[PDB]
Amino acid sequence: MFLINGHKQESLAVSDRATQFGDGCFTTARVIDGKVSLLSAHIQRLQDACQRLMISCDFWPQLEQEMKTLAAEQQNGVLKVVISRGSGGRGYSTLNSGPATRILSVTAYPAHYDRLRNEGITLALSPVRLGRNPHLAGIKHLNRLEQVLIRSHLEQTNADEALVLDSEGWVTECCAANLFWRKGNVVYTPRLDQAGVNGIMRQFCIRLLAQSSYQLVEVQASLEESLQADEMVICNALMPVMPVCACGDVSFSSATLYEYLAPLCERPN
Amino acid sequence: MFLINGHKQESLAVSDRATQFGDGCFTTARVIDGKVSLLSAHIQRLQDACQRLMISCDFWPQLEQEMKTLAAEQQNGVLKVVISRGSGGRGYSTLNSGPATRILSVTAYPAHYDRLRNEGITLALSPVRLGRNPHLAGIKHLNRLEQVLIRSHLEQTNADEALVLDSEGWVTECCAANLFWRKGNVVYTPRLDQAGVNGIMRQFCIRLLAQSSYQLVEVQASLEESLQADEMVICNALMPVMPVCACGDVSFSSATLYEYLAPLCERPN
Ligand SMILES: *Cc1c(COP(=O)(O)O)cnc(C)c1O
Ligand SMILES: *Cc1c(COP(=O)(O)O)cnc(C)c1O
């Protein structure tokens, strides 16, 4: 069951530009004890995506009400929101298209997470490299074929997530998560101005690390640099943080950064 | 009205992965006097896209029947076909998803084309540059946000189409068309192994030029190189070929290549 533009609908107009061109954005949020974690960050990230895509909406307070109501019904799980440009326009043009579509739905919280939390994550280098385009970088938009292909190659391994580089060879992210690595007291994360999704949990963690005694640096780094880390941690709104036992035959022995972030993200704070 | 998986439907399951991730491909074909032009090239391009996307279908003869029937009804116009992975799968994974969705529809032939044919096309350099990813290059897939943004920037000019470069600065294509340029007897077109859509009309034209006395070269070229041409021509299944009067304040004086290709593409051959 989905709530589309305010009422229950199982299907959507075929002409919707989400269906035709992926013309839109989305978020996935954690629901715990009836409430959306990080609710204002999720509204803000959707607002930001729509602005960069020129999708003008004024339904924000209604979308927020709807997210709260579905979260209270589901009680524990995942809430997914999609916003698209709507129908219309000639060819790719956005002229005369709209008004925007909003789609919400909720599911129970997935099993495998717990398993992964308690066993640790293995990473495998993806052969699929992300294109670089600052016009789309950072946004959680609907054009996610690159991630479908990354996931598909990942499944041919014994790895739980992927280490993903861009077309220039710079370490950018995972398949559906962001990446931090630590050497000593310095904690590194890729800059996402050319590719990648600037996740809600990534921003939360940067905030934490910024205020913490760790030093936090956003970099452009080669896979060889990243592999010399003492520790790797991955994150997304739902995990929210997971420890990395290895990326290939290179192993990581420490969990100190993980141990520090997990309690503050789980609440979250 | 759309024909979806064999029967008339106005709407599509919201969970369809076209809607969620743009997970699919499409074609747009010309209909003249009741028949699809270049019908087998359109089937072949869809087959090729689905193969590279790991979307397995065995409905091809039925899709071909359906395309013919809609073309006969519409008599003159445009036929659009979308194929998506279908619904299902956890997150981005394609495991347990499917079976594939096929969507067809037809519209009348658009007005402005004729106008553009008889007046000539003006091109404007796009500020939006295509990411490079050989895993998706060439395929007419549904992830077309880059083209929505290109179109949007184009509309802020007096240009009818865009000259589009990739992230390395190489001339790749237009917004919804492919690009040829001529210097002397040598005719150039960008190689589309890193970005771009390898259009049906582009392949037709390469076939023609290959057999012709012109010399045809697929290159990696800078915008400065391309701007020293004596002539530019753009193409897609629907135009099918258009002459270029200018790209900025640089003008083109000849139409010899256009004059040669237009009658053989209009039939088509
Ligand atoms: C959603 C997503 C993330 C993480 O985003 P969060 O907002 O923290 O959930 C990271 N990478 C990709 C490719 C994503 O789709
Ligand atoms: C569809 C399209 C073309 C031209 O494809 P044809 O098969 O000749 O119509 C060129 N570029 C883009 C970006 C396209 O979407």
Distances (CA, A) of B168 to A15, B130, B220: 34, 9, 10
Q: Where are the alpha helices (DSSP H) in chain B?
A: 17-21, 39-52, 60-74, 112-119, 145-154, 200-211, 223-226, 256-266
Q: Give the chain A residue nearest B19 (alpha carbons).
A: A19
A93 touches chain B (CB under 8 A): yes
Q: Is residue A113 part of a domain?
A: no
Distances (CA, A) of B90 to A107, A179, A180, A183, B45: 11, 21, 24, 34, 28
Q: Is residue A3 part of a domain?
A: yes
Pairing of strands B186-190, B215-219: parallel
Are both B134 and B207 inside the same structural domain?
Answer: yes
> HEC states along B108-160?
CCCCHHHHHHHHCEEEEECCCCECCCCCCCECCECCCHHHHHHHHHHCCCCCC
Looking at beta carbons, which pairs linking A164-167 to residues 24 or more positions away fall under 8 Å?
A: A164/A126, A164/A128, A164/A129, A164/A130, A165/A125, A165/A126, A165/A129, A165/A130, A165/A223, A166/A129, A166/A130, A166/A131, A166/A132, A166/A194, A166/A195, A166/A196, A167/A129, A167/A130, A167/A131, A167/A132, A167/B131, A167/B132, A167/B133, A167/B167
CATH number for the domain including B57? 3.30.470.10
**How is residue B230 annotated by DSSP?**
S
Look up A140 and say whether it is catalytic.
Answer: yes
Compute, in degrees rounded to 10, the torsion defined by CA atoms A146, A151, A152, A156: 140
Technique that determined the structure: X-ray
Q: Is residue B258 part of a domain?
A: yes
Are both B83 and B145 inside the same structural domain?
Answer: no
Pairing of strands B186-190, B2-4: unpaired
Q: Residues 236..265 of A with a Cβ closer than 8 Å to B: which?
A: none
Are both B69 and B174 inside the same structural domain?
Answer: no
Are both B142 and B258 inside the same structural domain?
Answer: yes
Q: How far apart are CA B234 and CA B250, in angstroms?
A: 16
DSSP for A66-121 reads: HHHHHHHHH-SEEEEEEEE--S--STT--TT--PPEEEEEEEPPPSHHHHHHHH-E
Residue-number span of the structural domain to which A190 is assigned? 121-265
- The token pair at A214 is 């760790």
- The token pair at A187 is 């904690």
Q: How far apart are CA B38 and CA B43, in angstroms?
A: 9
DSSP for A125-139 reads: E-S--BPP-TTTTB-
Q: How far apart are CA A19 and CA B265, in angstroms?
A: 31
Of A140, A146, A157, A266, which one is the catalytic site residue?
A140
Residue type (1 letter), B239? M
Q: How far apart are CA A112 and CA B210, in angstroms?
A: 55
- Angle at the Cα of A184 (from A178 to A185), degrees rounded to 5? 80
CATH number for the domain including B199? 3.20.10.10
Are both A66 and A137 inside the same structural domain?
Answer: no
Residue with tokens 């370490």: A171
Are both B147 and B260 inside the same structural domain?
Answer: yes
Are both B129 and B238 inside the same structural domain?
Answer: yes
Q: Is residue B1 part of a domain?
A: yes
Q: How far apart are CA A144 and CA B85, in angstroms?
A: 13
Are both A183 and A90 inside the same structural domain?
Answer: no
Q: How far apart are CA A242 and CA A145, in angstroms?
A: 24
List residues of B with catalytic annotation.
Answer: 28, 140, 173
Question: Of B83, B108, B133, which residue is a domain's last?
Answer: B108
Residue type (1 letter), B3? L
A149 touches chain B (CB under 8 A): yes
Are A45 and A140 in contact, with CB atoms under 8 Å apart?
A: yes
φ and ψ at B206, to 5 degrees?
-65, -45
- The token pair at B87 is 């619904």
Are both B36 and B95 inside the same structural domain?
Answer: yes
- The token pair at A109 is 């919280």
Best of A4, A26, A156, A167 to disrupt the B interface by mutation (most B CBs within 10 Å)?
A167
- The token pair at B80 is 């659009």
Least Cα distance to A261 among A198, A212, A226 occurs for: A212
For residue B10, report the distance from its CA to the centre of ligand 1, in Å. 32
> CB distance B141–A146 less than 8 Å?
no
Q: How far apart are CA A250 and CA A36, in angstroms?
A: 37
Q: Is residue B90 part of a domain?
A: yes
Are both B12 and B138 inside the same structural domain?
Answer: no
Q: Coil, helix or strand for A23? A: coil
The alpha carbon of residue B12 is apart from the nearest alpha carbon of chain A, in Å, by 5
Q: What's the total number of domains in chain B?
A: 2
Half-sphere exposure of A68 (CA within 13 A, CB side): 9
Are A206 and A189 in contact, with CB atoms under 8 Å apart?
A: yes
Residue type (1 letter), A59? F
Residue type (1 letter), B140? K
- Reply yes or no: is the peptide bond before residue B240 cis, omega within 30 of 0: yes
Residue type (1 letter), B39? L
Question: What distance, in Å, lies between the first and last C-alpha atoms of chain B?
Answer: 31
Q: Which residues pair with A242 in a beta bridge?
A: A234
Are both B238 and B125 inside the same structural domain?
Answer: yes
Q: Take atom 3 of ligand 1 and give the residue whose Cα is closest.
A: A177
Pocket of ligand 1 (CB under 6 A): A 140, 147, 173, 176-178, 197, 199-202, 236-237
Q: Spell out where chain A has E strands.
A: 2-4, 7-9, 11-13, 24-32, 35-36, 77-84, 101-107, 121-125, 161-165, 171-173, 178-183, 186-190, 215-219, 231-235, 241-247, 250-251
φ and ψ at B243, to 5 degrees?
-85, 145
Are both B102 and B136 inside the same structural domain?
Answer: no
Are B240 and B31 in contact, with CB atoms under 8 Å apart?
A: no
A220 touches chain B (CB under 8 A): no
Residue type (1 letter), B18? A
Question: Of B108, B134, B149, which residue is a domain's last?
Answer: B108
Q: Which residues pair with B102 in a beta bridge?
A: B83
